[PDB]
Amino acid sequence: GVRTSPTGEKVTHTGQVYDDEDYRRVRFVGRQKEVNENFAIDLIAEQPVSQVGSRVISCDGGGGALGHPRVYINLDKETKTGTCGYCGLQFRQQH
């Protein structure tokens, strides 16, 4: 159920939508314009905010040897959610 152009094109998770003037749109006549129906960003806000009672924590991003490499993120500032640079799934220190 992606946001749909006035033409009927389905814009993408980086909006590529062609303009009514552009001739190139004709290449979609009779054949489907393919886009992944499941956006990425929409699954980031899907995730809960993990909380740790420690000060500084790790993310393997899904377990050892499969995932992104280790990085320790600093949760010191609690007025924002410290985010992993690979996954994007937030962390906080509980109160």
Partner 1 sequence: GGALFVHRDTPKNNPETPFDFTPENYKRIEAIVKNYPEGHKAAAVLPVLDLAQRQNGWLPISAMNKVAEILQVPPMRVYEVATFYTMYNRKPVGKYHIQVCTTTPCM
Partner 2 sequence: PTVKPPTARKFIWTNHKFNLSGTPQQYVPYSTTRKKIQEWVPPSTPY
Partner 3 sequence: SNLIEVFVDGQSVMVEPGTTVLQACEKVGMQIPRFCYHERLSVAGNCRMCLVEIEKAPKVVAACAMPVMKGWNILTNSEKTKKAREGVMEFLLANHPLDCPICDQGGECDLQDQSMMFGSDRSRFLEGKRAVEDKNIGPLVKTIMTRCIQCTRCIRFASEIAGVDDLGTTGRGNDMQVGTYIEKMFMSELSGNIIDICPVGALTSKPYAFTARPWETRKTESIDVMDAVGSNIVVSTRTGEVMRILPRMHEDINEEWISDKTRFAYDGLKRQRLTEPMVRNEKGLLTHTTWEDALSRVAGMLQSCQGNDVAAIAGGLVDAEALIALKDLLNRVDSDTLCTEEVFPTAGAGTDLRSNYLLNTTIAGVEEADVVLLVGTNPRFEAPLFNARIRKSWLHNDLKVALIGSPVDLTYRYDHLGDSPKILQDIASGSHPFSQVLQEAKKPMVVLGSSALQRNDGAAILAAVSNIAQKIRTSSGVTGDWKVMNILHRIASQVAALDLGYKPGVEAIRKNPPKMLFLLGADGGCVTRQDLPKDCFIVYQGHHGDVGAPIADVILPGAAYTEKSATYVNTEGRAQQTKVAVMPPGLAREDWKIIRALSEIAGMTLPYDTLDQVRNRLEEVSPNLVRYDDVEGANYFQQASELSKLVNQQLLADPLVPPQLTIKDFYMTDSISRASQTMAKCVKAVTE
Binding site for partner 1 (CB under 8 A): 55-56, 72, 76-77, 79
- Considering beta carbons, is residue 14 or 79 the nearer one to partner 1? 79
Neighbours of 42 (CB within 10 A): 9
Run of H or E including 44: helix 41-44
Token reading at 17: 């939508």
Binding residues for partner 2, per CB under 8 A?
12, 14-16, 24, 27-28, 30-34, 38, 43
Binding residues for partner 3, per CB under 8 A?
56, 69-74, 76-77, 85-86
